[PDB]
Amino acid sequence: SPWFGMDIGGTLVKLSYFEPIDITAEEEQEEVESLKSIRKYLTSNVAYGSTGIRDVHLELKDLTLFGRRGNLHFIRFPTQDLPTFIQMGRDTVLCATGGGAYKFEKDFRTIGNLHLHKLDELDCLVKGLLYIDSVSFNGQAECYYFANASEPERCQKMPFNLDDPYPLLVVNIGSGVSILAVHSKDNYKRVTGTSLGGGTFLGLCSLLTGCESFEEALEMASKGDSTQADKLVRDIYGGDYERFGLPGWAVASSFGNMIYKEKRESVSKEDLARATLVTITNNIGSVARMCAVNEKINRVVFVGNFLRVNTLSMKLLAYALDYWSKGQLKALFLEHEGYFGAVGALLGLPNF
Amino acid sequence: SPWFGMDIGGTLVKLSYFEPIDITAEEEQEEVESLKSIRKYLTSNVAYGSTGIRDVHLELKDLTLFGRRGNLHFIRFPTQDLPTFIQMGRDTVLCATGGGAYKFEKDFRTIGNLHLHKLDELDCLVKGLLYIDSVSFNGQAECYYFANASEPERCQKMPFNLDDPYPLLVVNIGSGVSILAVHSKDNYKRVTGTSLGGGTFLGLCSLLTGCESFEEALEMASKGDSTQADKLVRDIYGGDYERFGLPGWAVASSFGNMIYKEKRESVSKEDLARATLVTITNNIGSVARMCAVNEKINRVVFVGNFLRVNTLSMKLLAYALDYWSKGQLKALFLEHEGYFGAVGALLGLPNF
Ligand SMILES: Nc1ncnc2c1ncn2[C@@H]1O[C@H](COP(=O)(O)OP(=O)(O)NP(=O)(O)O)[C@@H](O)[C@H]1O
Ligand SMILES: Nc1ncnc2c1ncn2[C@@H]1O[C@H](COP(=O)(O)OP(=O)(O)NP(=O)(O)O)[C@@H](O)[C@H]1O
Ligand SMILES: CC(C)c1ccc(CC(=O)N2CCN(c3ccc(C#N)nn3)CC2)cc1
Ligand SMILES: CC(C)c1ccc(CC(=O)N2CCN(c3ccc(C#N)nn3)CC2)cc1
Ligand SMILES: [Mg+2]
Ligand SMILES: [Mg+2]
C-alpha cells in the first residue's frame, strides 16, 4: 500500500506521502495499476483538483524510512473538501490524526477494506517535529530564529541547532492554539491552550474586511496601520507609563480606538486586517511567555499554519517575545510549518 | 476646598466626592458661595450635563474620613467629555490618577491656583480596594462570589470575607487589563497585562454590530448565541477531545466558524455581540488563571468597569475559573466596580 500520514484539522488536512525511489524491476512488475496510478498522479501534479496543493519546496529528498529510500512529500487541502478526497479514494492502512480522524472515522470506512488507525494529534506533533529536525531539511537546519529581532536593519533569519531539544515549549497555532511542554521524547504535557488562534484571525478578518482567503487577509494586513484601530499606552498617558516600564507604543486596548464613531468611519480595511493580525499574534506571544516562565523553559518554538507565508507574525513574535521577556526567551520557528502531525502519523505505520 | 479623588482612565473618568454631614452653624457661615454651590449641585442632581452620572446605589453613608463624618459619592463620565468638566471648573487640591492625570496635566492647570497631584493608577487601585473593603459597604460585605457557579439552578451571589486579604490577585479590566499580585498593604507587583480588555469588547462590537453604547452591546449579547460564530471542540472532533480533558462545548477557535461565507451570511448581530463578549471574557479568565498558578495565589478578584451591569461576564468568569482550575481558584467580585483608583487618590489628600 502507499505510505501516507494524515492530519485532519479543524481547517486544513495535511498529508505526508512517502514516494519510494528504490523500486526494483521486479517490484515494478508486481505493483498493481491503481498503485502506479496514485504515485504518478501525486508526483506529476502540484495542484490537485481545485484546492489541493503540494508544497514542493518542503520535499525531503532521498530519505531512508522503514528501510527504504524515497522522497517525503507534503500536501494540503481544506478540511471542507475532505468529501471530495474520500470520493476520489472510493472510485491501504491509513494512520490519521487531528480531530477529523475521529469526526470523519465513519467516512473513511466507506473506502472498502481501508484500515484506519487513529493517533493523538499532539503525540503526532511531537514525534513529527523531533523526527524532521533529526533528519534535517536536506542537510540544512529545520529550525531557525530571527537574529537581532529588536533592530530592523539587523534582523535576519538564522539557523538554530536543536540537537538536544529538551526542554522545549511548543506553541501550535492552528484554528486554535495548543501549548506543550516537552521534557523528553516520551514526556510532554499540554500546559494550556487559547481559542484566539488562526481561525480568529481569518474569521474576524473576513467579517471586518470582506477578504476571501488567508493570503488576501495577509496582503491587506501588510498595507495597514494597526494603530488606527488600537488604543496605545501613549493615547492614555500621553507617553510611556514609566512606573511599570510600559512604552508609549505598546497596545493598551486592541481595537480600543473603535469605540469612537468618527474613528470607525476613517479606519481602512487594511488597518483592520493589520489590527486583527497584531491582536492575535501578541496574545499568542504573551500566553507563550507566561507558560514558558511557569514551566522554566527558555526556548519557545512556534508551529502551525497560522504562520505559513506569514513573516509579519513571525517577526512580531520574535520581537515581542524578546522585548517583553527582557531577552530571557527566544522565539524559534520550523521550516515544516504545519506538517508535523502528518509526519508523526506516518511514523506510526510500523505499529500496525 | 472640596474633597475629591479622580481617576482619569482611557475611557472613563471616575470621581469620588466626600460630602461632609457634620457642618456646624459657624462653618456654614464661613463657607464661600461657590463651595456651597458645588455641594448643592453634586448632591441635588444624579445626572450631570448630558453624560455625567452619580451611582447613588454605591454611596457610603456616614463614613468617618480625615476626622470628619460625611457621605462618599461615586460619579463617572466619559474621558471624551473632560474638556467640558474643566470648562465648568474654570468658570482646590486635586489628587488625580490614571493615565489622564499625566495626559491632561496642562489642562487641569488652566484652572487658576488649582493644585494637581498625580498619583499612580495601580497604587491608588490597591489602596482604594483595601480601604473600601475595610470600612464595609454600609455594613454589608464589599466582596462577593458566585456560589456553586457550575450549577445554574444553584448559582447565587454570596458575600465573601476579605478580612485577611493577602495574598490576592487583582485583575483590573478597563480599556485594557492589568494584573496585580498583592502580598501586603505596601507590597505588590504588576504581574502582566493584556490588551484584550473592555475596549476590545466595545470596539469590536461597534464594528461588528453597529451598537452605539456599552449597554446596547450587552443587551445584544444577552440575546445571542456565541456558538453560531465560534468553532467548538465538538466541531473539530465530533465530541470531546478525551485525551486532554477538553469538553466538546469548549471553544477551540473564537470566531472560527466565520471563515465560512455561508455562516457569515446567517449569523446575527446578537450572535456576534455574544461571541465578542465570550471571547474577551474567557481570555481574561485564562490569563488570570495562568498568573494565579505562577504566583501561587488562589483568590482572584476582578474589578474595572468592563464588569459594571455585566452579570453575563461575571458569571462566565465565575464558572470558567472554577471549571478550568479544577476548583483550585475562586473568582471574587467587588461592589465598587471601577471606583477604587478614585478612592485611592482621595486617600492621598493628607500627604499634601
Ligand atoms: N490556505 C489556507 N486556508 C485556510 N487557512 C490557512 C491557509 N493557510 C494558512 N492558514 C492559516 O492556518 C490556520 C490553520 O492551521 P492548521 O495548523 O492547519 O490548523 P488545523 O490543524 O486545521 N486546526 P486544529 O484542529 O485546531 O489543529 C488557519 O486558521 C489560518 O490562519
Ligand atoms: N457607560 C460606559 N461607557 C463606556 N464604557 C463602559 C461604560 N460602562 C462600562 N464600560 C466598560 O468599561 C470599560 C472601561 O473601564 P474602566 O475601568 O473605567 O477603564 P479606564 O480606567 O477608563 N481605562 P484604563 O486607562 O485602561 O484603566 C470600557 O472599556 C467598557 O467595556
Ligand atoms: C495601564 C493600562 C493603561 C494598560 C493596560 C494593559 C496594557 C497592555 C500590557 O500590559 N501589555 C503587556 C504584555 N504584552 C505582551 C505582548 C506580547 C508579548 C509576547 N511575546 N508579551 N506581552 C501586551 C501589552 C498596557 C497598559
Ligand atoms: C486541540 C485543538 C482543537 C484545541 C485548541 C485550543 C483549544 C482551547 C483550549 O485549550 N482552552 C483551554 C483554556 N481555556 C480557558 C478558558 C477560560 C479559563 C478561565 N478562567 N481558562 N481557560 C479556553 C479553551 C481547544 C482545542
Ligand atoms: Mg492541527
Ligand atoms: Mg482605569
Author numbering:
A (entry chain A), B (entry chain A): 11 to 101, 109 to 369
From the manuscript:
The crystal structure of the PANK3•AMPPNP•Mg2+•PZ-2891 complex reveals that PZ-2891 binds across the dimer interface to simultaneously interact with both PANK3 protomers. The ‘ring of ligands’ linking the two protomers explains the high thermal stability of the complex. The isopropyl moiety packs into a hydrophobic cavity created by V250′, I253′, Y254′, Y258′, and A269′ located on the flexible flap that is disordered in the PANK3•AMPPNP•Mg2+ complex but becomes structured in the PANK3•AMPPNP•Mg2+•PZ-2891 complex. The carbonyl group forms hydrogen bond interactions with R207, which explains the lack of PZ-3067 binding. The piperazine ring acts as a spacer to present the pyridazine ring to the opposite protomer to hydrogen bond with R306′ and engage W341′ by π-π stacking interactions. PZ-2891 interaction with R306′ also allows an inter-protomer hydrogen bond between R306′ and T209 to further stabilize the dimer. Comparison of the PANK3•AMPPNP•Mg2+•PZ-2891 complex to the PANK3•AMPPNP•Mg2+•pantothenate complex shows that pantothenate and PZ-2891 both form hydrogen bonds with R207, and the isopropyl substituent of PZ-2891 docks into the hydrophobic cavity occupied by the dimethyl group of pantothenate. However, pantothenate does not interact with the dimer interface, and the connection between R306′ and T209 in the pantothenate complex is mediated by a water molecule rather than by a direct hydrogen bond. The structural analysis suggests that PZ-2891 first binds to the pantothenate site of the PANK3•ATP•Mg2+ complex followed by closing of the flexible loop, and the engagement and re-organization of the dimer interface. The induced fit mechanism is the most common binding mode observed in high-affinity inhibitors, and with PZ-2891 the two protomers become locked together to create a structure that is distinct from the structures of all the normal catalytic intermediates.
Pantothenate kinase (PANK, EC 2.7.1.33) is the first and rate-controlling step in the only pathway for coenzyme A (CoA) biosynthesis. The isoform expression level and potent feedback inhibition by acyl-CoAs control the intracellular CoA content. Within the cell, the PANK3 dimer exists in one of two distinct conformations: the inactive conformation stabilized by the binding of acetyl-CoA and the active conformation stabilized by the binding of ATP•Mg2+.
